[PDB]
Amino acid sequence: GAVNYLREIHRRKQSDVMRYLLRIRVCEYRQRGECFRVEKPTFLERARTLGYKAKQGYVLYIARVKKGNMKRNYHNGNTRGKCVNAGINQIKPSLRKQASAEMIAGKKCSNLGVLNSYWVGQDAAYKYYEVIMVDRDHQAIRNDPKINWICKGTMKHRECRGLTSASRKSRGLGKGVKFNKSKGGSIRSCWRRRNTLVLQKYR
Amino acid sequence: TDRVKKTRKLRGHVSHGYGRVGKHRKHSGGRGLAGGFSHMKTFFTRFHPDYHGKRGMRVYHRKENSDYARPISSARLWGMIPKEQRYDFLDNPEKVPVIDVREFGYHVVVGGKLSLERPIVVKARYFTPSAKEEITKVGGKWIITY
Amino acid sequence: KGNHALPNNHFRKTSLKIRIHHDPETKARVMAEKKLRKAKALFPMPLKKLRPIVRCPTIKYNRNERLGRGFTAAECEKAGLDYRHARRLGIAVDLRRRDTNQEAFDKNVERIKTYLGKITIYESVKEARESGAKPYTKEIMPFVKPKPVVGSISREEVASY
Amino acid sequence: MQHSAESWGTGRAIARVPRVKGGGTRRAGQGAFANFCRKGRMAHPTKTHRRWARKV
Amino acid sequence: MKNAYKKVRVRYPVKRPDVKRKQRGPRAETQESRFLAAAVADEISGLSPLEKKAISLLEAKNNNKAQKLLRKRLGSHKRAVAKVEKLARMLLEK
RNA sequence: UGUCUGAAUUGUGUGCGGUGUGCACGGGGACCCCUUGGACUUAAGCAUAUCAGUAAAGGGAGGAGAAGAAACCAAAUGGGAUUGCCUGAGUAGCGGCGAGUGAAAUGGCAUGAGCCUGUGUGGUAACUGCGUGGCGGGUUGUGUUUGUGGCAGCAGCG
RNA sequence: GUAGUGCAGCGCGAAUGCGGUGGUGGAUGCACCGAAGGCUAAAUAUGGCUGAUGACCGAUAGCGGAUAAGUAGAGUGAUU
RNA sequence: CAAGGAGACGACGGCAGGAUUGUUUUCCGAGAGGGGAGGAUGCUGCGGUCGGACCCGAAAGAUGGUGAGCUAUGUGUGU
Numbered sequence: 001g002a003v004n005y006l007r008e009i010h011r012r013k014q015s016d017v018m019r020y021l022l023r024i025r026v027c028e029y030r031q032r033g034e035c036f037r038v039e040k041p042t043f044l045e046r047a048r049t050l051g052y053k054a055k056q057g058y059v060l061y062i063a064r065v066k067k068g069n070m071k072r073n074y075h076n077g078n079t080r081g082k083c084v085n086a087g088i089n090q091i092k093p094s095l096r097k098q099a100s101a102e103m104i105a106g107k108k109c110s111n112l113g114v115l116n117s118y119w120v121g122q123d124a125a126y127k128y129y130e131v132i133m134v135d136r137d138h139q140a141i142r143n144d145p146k147i148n149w150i151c152k153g154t155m156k157h158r159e160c161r162g163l164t165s166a167s168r169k170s171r172g173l174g175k176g177v178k179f180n181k182s183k184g185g186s187i188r189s190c191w192r193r194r195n196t197l198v199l200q201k202y203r
Numbered sequence: 204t205d206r207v208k209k210t211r212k213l214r215g216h217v218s219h220g221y222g223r224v225g226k227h228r229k230h231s232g233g234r235g236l237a238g239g240f241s242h243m244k245t246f247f248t249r250f251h252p253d254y255h256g257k258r259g260m261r262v263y264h265r266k267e268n269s270d271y272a273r274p275i276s277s278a279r280l281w282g283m284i285p286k287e288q289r290y291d292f293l294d295n296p297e298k299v300p301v302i303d304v305r306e307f308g309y310h311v312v313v314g315g316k317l318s319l320e321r322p323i324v325v326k327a328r329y330f331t332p333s334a335k336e337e338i339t340k341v342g343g344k345w346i347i348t349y
Numbered sequence: 350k351g352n353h354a355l356p357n358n359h360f361r362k363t364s365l366k367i368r369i370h371h372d373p374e375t376k377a378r379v380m381a382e383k384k385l386r387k388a389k390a391l392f393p394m395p396l397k398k399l400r401p402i403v404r405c406p407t408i409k410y411n412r413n414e415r416l417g418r419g420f421t422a423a424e425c426e427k428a429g430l431d432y433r434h435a436r437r438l439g440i441a442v443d444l445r446r447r448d449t450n451q452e453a454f455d456k457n458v459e460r461i462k463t464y465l466g467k468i469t470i471y472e473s474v475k476e477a478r479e480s481g482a483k484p485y486t487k488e489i490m491p492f493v494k495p496k497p498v499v500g501s502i503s504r505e506e507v508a509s510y
Numbered sequence: 511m512q513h514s515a516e517s518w519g520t521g522r523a524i525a526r527v528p529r530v531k532g533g534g535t536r537r538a539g540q541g542a543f544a545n546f547c548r549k550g551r552m553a554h555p556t557k558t559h560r561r562w563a564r565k566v
Numbered sequence: 567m568k569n570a571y572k573k574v575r576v577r578y579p580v581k582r583p584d585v586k587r588k589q590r591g592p593r594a595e596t597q598e599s600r601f602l603a604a605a606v607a608d609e610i611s612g613l614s615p616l617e618k619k620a621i622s623l624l625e626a627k628n629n630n631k632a633q634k635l636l637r638k639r640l641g642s643h644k645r646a647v648a649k650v651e652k653l654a655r656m657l658l659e660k
Numbered sequence: 661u662g663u664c665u666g667a668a669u670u671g672u673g674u675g676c677g678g679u680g681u682g683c684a685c686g687g688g689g690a691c692c693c694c695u696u697g698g699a700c701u702u703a704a705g706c707a708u709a710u711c712a713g714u715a716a717a718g719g720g721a722g723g724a725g726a727a728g729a730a731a732c733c734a735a736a737u738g739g740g741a742u743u744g745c746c747u748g749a750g751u752a753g754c755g756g757c758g759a760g761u762g763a764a765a766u767g768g769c770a771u772g773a774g775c776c777u778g779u780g781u782g783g784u785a786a787c788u789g790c791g792u793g794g795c796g797g798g799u800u801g802u803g804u805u806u807g808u809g810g811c812a813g814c815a816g817c818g
Numbered sequence: 819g820u821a822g823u824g825c826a827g828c829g830c831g832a833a834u835g836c837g838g839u840g841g842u843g844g845a846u847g848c849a850c851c852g853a854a855g856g857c858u859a860a861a862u863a864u865g866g867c868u869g870a871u872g873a874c875c876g877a878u879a880g881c882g883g884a885u886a887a888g889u890a891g892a893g894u895g896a897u898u
Numbered sequence: 899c900a901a902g903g904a905g906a907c908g909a910c911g912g913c914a915g916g917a918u919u920g921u922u923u924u925c926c927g928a929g930a931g932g933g934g935a936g937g938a939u940g941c942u943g944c945g946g947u948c949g950g951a952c953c954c955g956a957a958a959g960a961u962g963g964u965g966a967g968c969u970a971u972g973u974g975u976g977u
Binding site (some may be wrong): 230231232233234235236237238239240241242255256257261262263264265266267268269349 | 702736752758767
């Protein structure tokens with residue numbers, strides 16, 4: 001099929017053709033700003049496997065993120081406590097950088113809803129991601145039952161609450177005994193149930 | 204009845220039973236089991252001498268359902284027959300019971316004398332050597348089952 | 350002080366919480382009214398589904414049977430049926446389970462045929478009302494296990510009964 | 511227990527119980543929190559998880 | 567289970583039935599369209615720099631030096647052997 | 661019906677159109693999801709440890725939320741999505757092997773339910789947002805009929 | 819979670835009769851499963867509001883507050 | 899002088915006295931190996947541990963906020 005050929009090409013990043021197209025388009029992104037709109041998909045077939053359609057009410061934005069360890073701001077490294085808590089410089093963030101990019105694009109368009117995202121390039125200082133967003137107020141979206149689920153009320157700002165695929169990845173969910181610390185639905189609700197003592201009336 | 208409560212007889216007596224010279228203070232001695240190698244060392248020596256230290260191999264995740272091997276003695280094996288069928292066997296002394304301990308929750312057979320001088324058949328996993336002697340001594344026989 | 354077992358009572362966390370329902374008699378009967386109200390909103394159909402007989406896993410529970418989750422597609426086919434059509438007749442289907450025993454496969458085929466002979470088909474809720482069909486909140490054909498009985502032979506105890 | 515009371519310490523010729531902060535009202539400077547103070551709390555407050563029933 | 571119990575052990579006779587199981591993997595009636603797409607991709611695209619430097623080690627004869635350079639840069643040992651098997655057959659065809 | 665104010669906006673950001681017309685912002689936050697993150701205290705001192713990933717702070721939701729249909733558990737003649745309770749068990753284990761800390765499977769109950777998609781015609785896009793037999797989108801791929809009818813229930817008023 | 823139980827930064831970066839897992843690092847048999855796209859009732863939690871109850875308190879008690887009470891009054895202010 | 903004012907409550911274990919019933923028991927050993935020997939479920943009291951823990955009391959530590967109308971220094975504009 002037509003989609004088989006495009007998949008085999010896009011998998012070979014860094015082979016003599018993708019190394020030409022990556023350098024040419026990442027030079028475009030460096031001249032735009034922090035978050036901007038694009039009209040067609042970069043990797044057409046990776047975007048359709050993540051849920052994109054050619055229809056009114058679908059939108060694409062590109063956002064960059066700044067690439068390194070997280071910051072801690074104490075004046076000259078004074079942290080006002082014990083020495084096991086006094087590290088400043090090699091602390092790693094809890095979320096992924098693909099999820100940080102969704103939070104940038106989701107505040108810029110507060111009337112839309114985020115669906116998924118994917119990698120499109122890289123710099124020495126930045127990485128670039130491609131965010132797919134949907135219009136919850138258009139009637140083209142509210143009328144068809146393949147995307148209709150996103151127009152109700154529990155679906156607002158999915159990427160702030162950890163409900164997209166990139167931000168889901170860091171919650172610690174799964175199957176079997178290697179995922180005992182999330183039984184009940186998350187880490188915090190495993191903690192609460194195990195820190196509760198239940199008693200019967202007749203005891 | 205049944206000794207109402209000490210506090211009811213202590214009203215009026217200063218210090219409520221805890222002494223005047225030595226008093227009732229907070230945690231004089233440390234909390235819980237502190238001092239176990241220094242000032243409470245006489246406590247562990249007199250009452251719990253095997254409590255500290257390591258001793259042994261450490262298996263992560265012992266598997267208990269697969270190691271269940273509950274034993275029963277040959278000395279009973281006859282009071283195990285249910286109450287209804289028991290009088291049927293004691294009245295006709297020419298029939299042989301066929302009892303399978305596995306259907307009552309037991310796995311291994313050990314133990315002593317058979318409580319009667321008639322033959323029987325007994326199925327299980329793993330009879331020990333002494334159980335084999337006392338089942339054969341009455342004319343019965345033993346079998347290994349699943 | 351004294352000779353006692355060493356205590357291990359865990360109350361060192363201020364974040365701990367206690368939980369008690371102080372009236373479980375009114376809570377049980379409020380849930381039995383919910384259960385009888387679903388039953389006559391599904392009226393003709395009995396609110397519980399037919400489930401198979403299965404076998405407990407390890408060597409400790411080897412000799413015990415039990416009600417399981419659902420029937421397989423081969424057990425439904427040999428009872429004269431398609432698993433898409435067994436689900437419209439109140440039968441639970443489980444496509445994860447695998448078929449590896451021929452005796453157990455046969456008990457479950459006869460459990461389906463027995464159930465298929467105790468149901469009646471109609472065309473409307475009006476007919477079932479007029480024929481005496483009532484609502485059902487219990488479970489369909491519960492499994493009970495039998496008592497242990499002792500076999501008996503007579504002085505032929507060398508052919509190894 | 512609905513105050514920000516604090517004891518005044520010794521050196522002022524009054525007893526050591528904690529006392530209300532402020533001014534301009536007769537509540538200012540009076541005792542608080544203790545089981546022997548007017549408007550205090552009970553030494554051992556009554557709780558809901560005591561045993562009410564028994565088993566026969 | 568105890569070792570004395572495993573010797574006299576006796577299992578239950580089961581009478582296994584006959585019914586087909588699942589498929590589990592890439593299907594056998596689509597190799598033609600999978601083999602065709604991979605033969606178009608290698609003509610279009612070139613070679614990665616890592617595959618260039620590894621056919622030059624196989625070029626001389628150094629099947630060992632090429633074996634450790636691929637095991638260091640692909641974080642596996644089962645994978646580094648499956649790759650020097652493809653890059654050897656592309657020389658015979660070539 | 662509701663003076664003058666207050667997000668307080670004749671604004672800022674953004675979708676669809678092509679100059680028309682939408683949407684977001686604040687309030688509250690007991691319970692829920694995500695981020696960040698203490699010290700008092702216990703170890704009869706104290707630095708790893710403990711208190712505790714808890715309090716405080718910030719962002720985002722609802723009548724609940726989150727989770728969920730095996731790249732599972734196991735080692736039998738095998739079970740079979742998620743969530744809650746009892747047993748397992750203060751146990752296996754972690755730990756200046758100190759003080760301390762700490763699961764799960766099986767078994768028994770409650771409740772039970774499974775589906776949609778990225779490769780759909782070629783004898784003709786079979787599709788739909790706006791409008792009354794047309795415009796906009798779409799081949800870099802759209803594919804969305806129907807309830808003043810029936811059945812069961814819940815609250816209120818006189 | 820004991821020699822990753824899970825998560826993240828930086829760097830390297832896969833496969834197509836193929837891939838993943840089996841409480842000690844690695845090898846090899848046998849067993850069991852298909853990740854990296856999407857949705858999903860019920861049984862569970864809980865300030866406040868409204869109904870119904872109680873071996874609860876009876877004006878220094880019970881909510882701070884049985885009355886024109888977060889009022890009179892105090893503080894530059896946050897607050898009290 | 900009046901009124902108020904301090905060993906009560908929860909969890910887990912032991913023993914004493916009392917109630918109902920009684921056809922009760924998975925052992926040794928690090929392991930490899932070896933292998934028959936009257937309690938259970940409630941009720942009241944006392945001793946033990948962790949809980950604010952018989953009642954009242956520090957000098958301190960941390961998280962989040964308010965102030966240059968007193969007073970200190972710089973700077974614009976007047977006397």
